[PDB]
Write an enzyme that holds these catalytic residues in place. Structure first.
Site, PDB file in Angstrom:
ATOM      1  N   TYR A   1     -22.477   8.367 -91.452  1.00  0.00           N
ATOM      2  CA  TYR A   1     -22.740   7.464 -92.574  1.00  0.00           C
ATOM      3  C   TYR A   1     -21.773   7.511 -93.752  1.00  0.00           C
ATOM      4  CZ  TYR A   1     -27.154   6.245 -90.361  1.00  0.00           C
ATOM      5  OH  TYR A   1     -28.084   5.761 -89.467  1.00  0.00           O
TER       6      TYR A   1
ATOM      7  N   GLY B   1     -18.728   6.755 -95.357  1.00  0.00           N
ATOM      8  CA  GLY B   1     -17.587   5.882 -95.147  1.00  0.00           C
ATOM      9  C   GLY B   1     -18.173   4.498 -94.957  1.00  0.00           C
TER      10      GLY B   1
ATOM     11  N   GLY C   1     -19.920   1.454 -93.620  1.00  0.00           N
ATOM     12  CA  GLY C   1     -20.804   1.310 -92.478  1.00  0.00           C
ATOM     13  C   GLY C   1     -21.564   2.588 -92.172  1.00  0.00           C
TER      14      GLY C   1
ATOM     15  N   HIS D   1     -27.630   6.836 -99.445  1.00  0.00           N
ATOM     16  CA  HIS D   1     -26.754   6.070-100.326  1.00  0.00           C
ATOM     17  C   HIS D   1     -26.523   4.673 -99.735  1.00  0.00           C
ATOM     18  CE1 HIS D   1     -22.682   5.194-102.245  1.00  0.00           C
ATOM     19  NE2 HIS D   1     -23.468   5.420-103.274  1.00  0.00           N
ATOM     20  N   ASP D   2     -26.305   4.613 -98.423  1.00  0.00           N
ATOM     21  CA  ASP D   2     -26.094   3.345 -97.731  1.00  0.00           C
ATOM     22  C   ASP D   2     -27.323   2.452 -97.896  1.00  0.00           C
ATOM     23  OD1 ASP D   2     -23.684   4.434 -96.831  1.00  0.00           O
ATOM     24  OD2 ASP D   2     -24.042   3.912 -94.735  1.00  0.00           O
TER      25      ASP D   2
ATOM     26  N   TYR E   1     -27.536   1.028-101.378  1.00  0.00           N
ATOM     27  CA  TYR E   1     -26.603  -0.082-101.567  1.00  0.00           C
ATOM     28  C   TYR E   1     -27.161  -1.345-100.909  1.00  0.00           C
ATOM     29  CZ  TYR E   1     -22.382   2.153-103.579  1.00  0.00           C
ATOM     30  OH  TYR E   1     -21.461   2.767-104.400  1.00  0.00           O
TER      31      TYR E   1
ATOM     32  N   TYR F   1     -19.363  -0.298-113.460  1.00  0.00           N
ATOM     33  CA  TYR F   1     -20.485  -0.014-114.348  1.00  0.00           C
ATOM     34  C   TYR F   1     -20.043   1.083-115.306  1.00  0.00           C
ATOM     35  CZ  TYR F   1     -21.061   3.732-110.879  1.00  0.00           C
ATOM     36  OH  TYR F   1     -20.831   4.776-110.010  1.00  0.00           O
TER      37      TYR F   1
ATOM     38  N   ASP G   1     -25.334   5.792-106.931  1.00  0.00           N
ATOM     39  CA  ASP G   1     -24.182   6.689-106.949  1.00  0.00           C
ATOM     40  C   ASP G   1     -24.520   8.046-107.552  1.00  0.00           C
ATOM     41  OD1 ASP G   1     -22.746   4.646-105.796  1.00  0.00           O
ATOM     42  OD2 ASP G   1     -21.523   4.204-107.558  1.00  0.00           O
TER      43      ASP G   1
HETATM   44  C1  LIG Z   1     -16.010   8.944-101.997  1.00  0.00           C
HETATM   45  O1  LIG Z   1     -17.150   9.242-101.108  1.00  0.00           O
HETATM   46  C2  LIG Z   1     -17.790   8.241-100.429  1.00  0.00           C
HETATM   47  C3  LIG Z   1     -18.885   8.721 -99.600  1.00  0.00           C
HETATM   48  C4  LIG Z   1     -19.638   7.785 -98.828  1.00  0.00           C
HETATM   49  C5  LIG Z   1     -19.370   6.365 -98.839  1.00  0.00           C
HETATM   50  C6  LIG Z   1     -20.118   5.288 -98.035  1.00  0.00           C
HETATM   51  O2  LIG Z   1     -21.027   5.658 -97.321  1.00  0.00           O
HETATM   52  O3  LIG Z   1     -19.788   4.022 -98.116  1.00  0.00           O
HETATM   53  C7  LIG Z   1     -18.261   5.922 -99.685  1.00  0.00           C
HETATM   54  C8  LIG Z   1     -17.493   6.831-100.471  1.00  0.00           C
HETATM   55 CA   LIG Z   2     -19.973  -4.804-113.485  1.00  0.00          CA
HETATM   56 CA   LIG Z   3     -21.691   4.402 -95.274  1.00  0.00          CA
END
Ligand SMILES: COc1ccc(C(=O)O)cc1
Ligand SMILES: [Ca+2]
Ligand SMILES: [Ca+2]
Ligand SMILES: [Ca+2]
Ligand SMILES: [Cl-]
Length: 123
Positions: free
Chosen positions: A28, A30, A32, A48-49, A52, A73, A99
């Site tokens: 997860y 990164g 997607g 976190h995904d 979002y 933000y 975040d």
């Molecule tokens: C900089 O760290 C990250 C960690 C996870 C994600 C994500 O899940 O999209 C994006 C940036």
């Molecule tokens: Ca904004």
């Molecule tokens: Ca992700």
């Protein structure tokens, strides 16, 4: 925005370069994500995904062309504590919260280098 999320993680983990350490980790962390999280850090990214995904559903976020990664933000780091600003409007405030929660989560779980650059086939 991505830049602020990076700063937030550094706020909780002063010795890290977030975009290098946490990007493309597990199933997860990164862009997607799917499958069963490989460890607790990966689970932080899963949450976190989901956060979002929920944000994009908000009426306030749908009136904006920006997405969670590009929506800037306001927040501050002080004594390694993160504070989302009251000057954030509805959408950005929600993303700021997503975040902040993830940054704290990352700082409380173990890091397993073995899961870095994990093959999306294991997901
Ligand atoms: C900089 O760290 C990250 C960690 C996870 C994600 C994500 O899940 O999209 C994006 C940036
Ligand atoms: Ca904004
Ligand atoms: Ca992700
Ligand atoms: Ca699968
Ligand atoms: Cl904090």
């Amino acid at each position: 925005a991505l830049w602020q999320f990076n700063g937030m993680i550094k706020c909780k983990i002063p010795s890290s370069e977030p975009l290098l350490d946490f990007n493309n980790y597990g199933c997860y962390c990164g862009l997607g994500g799917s499958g069963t999280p490989v460890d607790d850090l990966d689970r932080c990214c899963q949450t976190h995904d989901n956060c979002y995904m929920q944000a994009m559903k908000l009426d306030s976020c749908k009136v904006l062309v920006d997405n969670p990664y590009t929506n800037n933000y306001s927040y501050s780091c002080s004594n390694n504590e993160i504070t989302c600003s009251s000057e954030n409007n509805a959408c950005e405030a929600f993303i700021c919260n997503c975040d902040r929660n993830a940054a704290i989560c990352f700082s409380k779980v173990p890091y397993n280098k073995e899961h870095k650059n994990l093959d999306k086939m294991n997901c």
